Design an enzyme around this catalytic site. Sequence first.
Site, PDB file in Angstrom:
ATOM      1  N   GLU A   1       0.821  -1.208   0.000  1.00 17.16           N
ATOM      2  CA  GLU A   1       0.000   0.000   0.000  1.00 17.16           C
ATOM      3  C   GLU A   1       0.855   1.259   0.000  1.00 17.16           C
ATOM      4  O   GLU A   1       0.690   2.137  -0.854  1.00 17.16           O
ATOM      5  CB  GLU A   1      -0.936  -0.015   1.209  1.00 17.16           C
ATOM      6  CG  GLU A   1      -1.701   1.278   1.437  1.00 17.16           C
ATOM      7  CD  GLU A   1      -2.592   1.214   2.668  1.00 17.16           C
ATOM      8  OE1 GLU A   1      -2.924   0.092   3.106  1.00 17.16           O
ATOM      9  OE2 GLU A   1      -2.959   2.284   3.198  1.00 17.16           O
TER      10      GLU A   1
ATOM     11  N   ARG B   1       7.241   4.081   7.537  1.00 15.78           N
ATOM     12  CA  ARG B   1       6.004   4.500   8.185  1.00 15.78           C
ATOM     13  C   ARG B   1       6.340   4.885   9.623  1.00 15.78           C
ATOM     14  O   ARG B   1       6.634   4.019  10.452  1.00 15.78           O
ATOM     15  CB  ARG B   1       4.962   3.390   8.130  1.00 15.78           C
ATOM     16  CG  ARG B   1       3.595   3.793   8.645  1.00 15.78           C
ATOM     17  CD  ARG B   1       2.634   2.627   8.574  1.00 15.78           C
ATOM     18  NE  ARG B   1       1.249   3.040   8.780  1.00 15.78           N
ATOM     19  CZ  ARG B   1       0.627   3.015   9.953  1.00 15.78           C
ATOM     20  NH1 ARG B   1       1.264   2.600  11.040  1.00 15.78           N
ATOM     21  NH2 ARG B   1      -0.638   3.405  10.034  1.00 15.78           N
TER      22      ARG B   1
HETATM   23  N1  LIG Z   1     -17.624   9.624  -1.838  1.00 18.34           N
HETATM   24  C1  LIG Z   1     -17.032   9.309  -0.683  1.00 18.34           C
HETATM   25  N2  LIG Z   1     -17.454   8.213  -0.019  1.00 18.34           N
HETATM   26  C2  LIG Z   1     -16.865   7.895   1.137  1.00 18.34           C
HETATM   27  N3  LIG Z   1     -15.871   8.522   1.771  1.00 18.34           N
HETATM   28  C3  LIG Z   1     -15.472   9.603   1.090  1.00 18.34           C
HETATM   29  C4  LIG Z   1     -15.982  10.059  -0.113  1.00 18.34           C
HETATM   30  N4  LIG Z   1     -15.323  11.205  -0.526  1.00 18.34           N
HETATM   31  C5  LIG Z   1     -14.445  11.418   0.422  1.00 18.34           C
HETATM   32  N5  LIG Z   1     -14.480  10.495   1.437  1.00 18.34           N
HETATM   33  C6  LIG Z   1     -13.600  10.479   2.605  1.00 18.34           C
HETATM   34  O1  LIG Z   1     -12.435   9.746   2.275  1.00 18.34           O
HETATM   35  C7  LIG Z   1     -12.148   8.783   3.303  1.00 18.34           C
HETATM   36  C8  LIG Z   1     -11.477   7.576   2.698  1.00 18.34           C
HETATM   37  O2  LIG Z   1     -10.374   8.018   1.882  1.00 18.34           O
HETATM   38  P1  LIG Z   1      -9.391   6.983   1.215  1.00 18.34           P
HETATM   39  O3  LIG Z   1      -7.993   7.595   1.078  1.00 18.34           O
HETATM   40  O4  LIG Z   1      -9.995   6.516  -0.054  1.00 18.34           O
HETATM   41  O5  LIG Z   1      -9.318   5.839   2.320  1.00 18.34           O
HETATM   42  P2  LIG Z   1      -9.256   4.306   2.062  1.00 18.34           P
HETATM   43  O6  LIG Z   1      -8.061   3.950   1.236  1.00 18.34           O
HETATM   44  O7  LIG Z   1     -10.550   3.830   1.343  1.00 18.34           O
HETATM   45  N6  LIG Z   1      -9.157   3.564   3.567  1.00 18.34           N
HETATM   46  P3  LIG Z   1      -7.639   2.926   3.995  1.00 18.34           P
HETATM   47  O8  LIG Z   1      -7.718   1.354   3.970  1.00 18.34           O
HETATM   48  O9  LIG Z   1      -7.292   3.360   5.389  1.00 18.34           O
HETATM   49  O10 LIG Z   1      -6.490   3.414   3.024  1.00 18.34           O
HETATM   50  C9  LIG Z   1     -13.487   8.509   3.971  1.00 18.34           C
HETATM   51  O11 LIG Z   1     -13.283   8.118   5.323  1.00 18.34           O
HETATM   52  C10 LIG Z   1     -14.196   9.864   3.880  1.00 18.34           C
HETATM   53  O12 LIG Z   1     -13.920  10.668   5.018  1.00 18.34           O
HETATM   54  C1  LIG Z   2      -2.832   1.250   6.887  1.00 16.66           C
HETATM   55  C2  LIG Z   2      -4.159   1.787   7.416  1.00 16.66           C
HETATM   56  C3  LIG Z   2      -5.288   0.788   7.197  1.00 16.66           C
HETATM   57  C4  LIG Z   2      -4.048   2.161   8.894  1.00 16.66           C
HETATM   58  C5  LIG Z   2      -3.757   1.182   9.831  1.00 16.66           C
HETATM   59  C6  LIG Z   2      -3.655   1.519  11.172  1.00 16.66           C
HETATM   60  C7  LIG Z   2      -3.845   2.835  11.568  1.00 16.66           C
HETATM   61  C8  LIG Z   2      -3.727   3.209  13.041  1.00 16.66           C
HETATM   62  C9  LIG Z   2      -2.284   3.041  13.498  1.00 16.66           C
HETATM   63  O1  LIG Z   2      -1.394   3.045  12.714  1.00 16.66           O
HETATM   64  N1  LIG Z   2      -2.010   2.872  14.905  1.00 16.66           N
HETATM   65  C10 LIG Z   2      -3.043   2.857  15.866  1.00 16.66           C
HETATM   66  C11 LIG Z   2      -2.753   3.771  17.047  1.00 16.66           C
HETATM   67  N2  LIG Z   2      -1.475   3.337  17.674  1.00 16.66           N
HETATM   68  C12 LIG Z   2      -1.183   3.529  19.075  1.00 16.66           C
HETATM   69  C13 LIG Z   2      -2.165   3.323  20.029  1.00 16.66           C
HETATM   70  C14 LIG Z   2      -1.836   3.512  21.363  1.00 16.66           C
HETATM   71  C15 LIG Z   2      -0.541   3.900  21.679  1.00 16.66           C
HETATM   72  C16 LIG Z   2      -0.120   4.121  23.125  1.00 16.66           C
HETATM   73  N3  LIG Z   2       0.202   4.288  24.197  1.00 16.66           N
HETATM   74  C17 LIG Z   2       0.386   4.082  20.671  1.00 16.66           C
HETATM   75  N4  LIG Z   2       0.034   3.893  19.419  1.00 16.66           N
HETATM   76  C18 LIG Z   2      -0.403   3.509  16.652  1.00 16.66           C
HETATM   77  C19 LIG Z   2      -0.702   2.698  15.401  1.00 16.66           C
HETATM   78  C20 LIG Z   2      -4.129   3.814  10.632  1.00 16.66           C
HETATM   79  C21 LIG Z   2      -4.234   3.475   9.292  1.00 16.66           C
HETATM   80 MG   LIG Z   3      -5.948   4.121   1.176  1.00 15.29          MG
END
Ligand SMILES: Nc1ncnc2c1ncn2[C@@H]1O[C@H](COP(=O)(O)OP(=O)(O)NP(=O)(O)O)[C@@H](O)[C@H]1O
Ligand SMILES: CC(C)c1ccc(CC(=O)N2CCN(c3ccc(C#N)cn3)CC2)cc1
Ligand SMILES: [Mg+2]
Lengths: 352, 352
Positions: free
Chosen positions: B121, B190
Amino acid sequence: SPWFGMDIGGTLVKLSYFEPIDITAEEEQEEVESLKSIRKYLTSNVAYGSTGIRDVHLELKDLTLFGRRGNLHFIRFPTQDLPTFIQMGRDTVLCATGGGAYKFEKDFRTIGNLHLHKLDELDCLVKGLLYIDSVSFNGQAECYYFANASEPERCQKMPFNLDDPYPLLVVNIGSGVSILAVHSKDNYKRVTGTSLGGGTFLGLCSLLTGCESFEEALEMASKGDSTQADKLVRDIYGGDYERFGLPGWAVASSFGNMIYKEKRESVSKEDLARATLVTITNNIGSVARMCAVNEKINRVVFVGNFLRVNTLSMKLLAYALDYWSKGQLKALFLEHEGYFGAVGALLGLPNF
Amino acid sequence: SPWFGMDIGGTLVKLSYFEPIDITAEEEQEEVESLKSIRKYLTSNVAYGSTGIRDVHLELKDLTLFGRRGNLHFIRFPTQDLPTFIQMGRDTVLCATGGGAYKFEKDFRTIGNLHLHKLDELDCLVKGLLYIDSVSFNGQAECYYFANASEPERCQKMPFNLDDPYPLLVVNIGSGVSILAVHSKDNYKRVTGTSLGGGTFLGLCSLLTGCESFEEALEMASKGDSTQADKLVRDIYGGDYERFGLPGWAVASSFGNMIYKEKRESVSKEDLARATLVTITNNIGSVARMCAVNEKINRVVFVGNFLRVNTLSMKLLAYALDYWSKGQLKALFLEHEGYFGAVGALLGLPNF
Ligand SMILES: Nc1ncnc2c1ncn2[C@@H]1O[C@H](COP(=O)(O)OP(=O)(O)NP(=O)(O)O)[C@@H](O)[C@H]1O
Ligand SMILES: CC(C)c1ccc(CC(=O)N2CCN(c3ccc(C#N)cn3)CC2)cc1
Ligand SMILES: [Mg+2]
Ligand SMILES: Nc1ncnc2c1ncn2[C@@H]1O[C@H](COP(=O)(O)OP(=O)(O)NP(=O)(O)O)[C@@H](O)[C@H]1O
Ligand SMILES: CC(C)c1ccc(CC(=O)N2CCN(c3ccc(C#N)cn3)CC2)cc1
Ligand SMILES: [Mg+2]
């Protein structure tokens, strides 16, 4: 003049009161009846009015302070009820801290001849914390951690030694969150803060569940399943995200499953209360971890009343801070969580 | 085989499609009708089914890729509707990324003889971002910032040059948030992440206001007053907290005024929608700032679809990042916000 320390925060007023227990014969006669009446009112009651509470279990007995033996009492009530406290007072030198020492300064002066001395909120926090730990909790350790927080079968409260406390990261979880780097007794700074604290948990949980008290929201959260509202890593990947060491159970998106109408209709109030607590607690621990790395401090102590009678958040912080730092950071807690500002204010009394 | 790049996230599927515009005479005859039908279906329609949308304004025209001239198209639809896309496909080598490339791997293989190649990703995110910026947005800058973001009378969108991008902090706001430190084209990590992202805004706003779409929640938030729900520094101090440079308008406790029953009864849905947006946006910017200081990187670029058609969050990030870092950090944005993973996946095609 009675010896008070007052921390007027956004949500709760905290009060530390020193009850002299070495009153001689001549001293008792010289007592004015209003002073005898106040001391008798505070020590014979544990509930004051409808919202004042004395935390009896926190009392420090036979403490030597300002050259006198006495007991240190800890009392709290909602800031919303401060006008009732002031009107009671209009029926003395007051060291006051917290934002309310400035916001309500003119109201305190309606009490005739009262001398209000404002002290810095985080200055009293540090002074109070180091003092209580130094005198101990009636021979017991004031500081404690959760040993083996990664394993629930072994996770138990264990005392912790802070005889040389510095350097120390203090994470004050009140209405919001303040994060302090304490380098010495006179060298400390506010690193940053976050606005996602106890008031966010209480405020959001009240919107989502209709709970009427902090204790009720904690009770609901203990019965809920936060995963009904949160989207986990395994809901996105199907399991772990191995490439970046993210376990499937980690929360990827807080309340993220509430974007689907059918999941909003099957979620319970207890689930939402729990997801609110987990969201706030994990964000606090994550911010605390980032500050600890930046400040190069491995001892993180959490205070403030968000954690009183809230073992769920404490264990959550203990587990999370240990897991995400790979055992390089230790979550620490203090028995007198929310009263350190009130104590520190009381300690500024000789300066006047 | 058509040239697709697919990023299957927790919420949205993003698809980059390369339409050849240099098809010769002999090439057209050798076309299979199903390939002519797919290309004609994608370029003659801007809405696919009930939920597929082609973002026409993002199209890169006359792009030379893999030695061929063509147009790069950007298409999105909800991950919830991926089974419909797959069933359409069952009526080709597919480079796929995002969590859904693993979660739905077995479903893609129901398409006969289809070759699914999973790509990381955040590996595709970096590759896609650096590629789009390098080829530009049809001669225009792909990257832009908000100049004089501290002053609304002067705050305007201005292009930004990334010809030597490194070092770079990438803050990917999807369902959750990923934060990347990019040190070179092949050296990046990351740093951390947070679970308070676009799904939290959408999920909470749906619980609090009953909104049925991301655009509707943005529309409500634009009409609301977040200060009706949030507790400000001046609600606690009466004004500024000068000692630690906290202005009275700063949010001390998000949703902190919702602890009072009378304030919950007078707050509107637009106020709650706005407070949700402000809470999520400020926390993202604050976390981004902490990572930037720790990584010693002063260029912070925000991507992900939380910011599409969301100028409120962009300006909020631009103002906040500039204010709280005292002008030492610059908030940067990219025209193709949510499509960089899909592009990066497409670029992995020669490796097979
Ligand atoms: N049409 C839409 N439908 C849903 N969410 C939308 C839309 N337009 C914008 N968003 C926002 O965009 C966010 C998701 O963005 P996006 O970068 O596509 O995440 P994602 O890749 O689908 N999830 P992730 O697995 O964490 O990468 C949603 O949580 C909304 O806040
Ligand atoms: C890659 C996408 C799907 C994604 C995965 C995970 C997350 C959230 C994340 O990456 N995390 C959760 C919060 N985490 C914490 C929680 C408690 C403490 C303390 N004390 C320290 N870190 C860090 C990692 C977002 C997007
Ligand atoms: Mg994404
Ligand atoms: N009885 C209670 N009533 C209200 N809140 C409580 C209570 N017990 C625990 N809390 C929690 O404690 C938080 C406030 O803790 P506290 O450290 O006293 O903050 P504060 O000082 O009043 N606000 P601040 O101005 O930011 O320092 C609330 O937001 C609740 O989450
Ligand atoms: C002292 C008590 C009352 C208190 C005051 C203030 C706070 C909150 C706080 O201290 N802050 C708010 C969040 N801030 C941001 C916001 C956006 C960005 C970006 N981009 C960076 N920082 C930092 C300061 C808690 C408790
Ligand atoms: Mg406080």
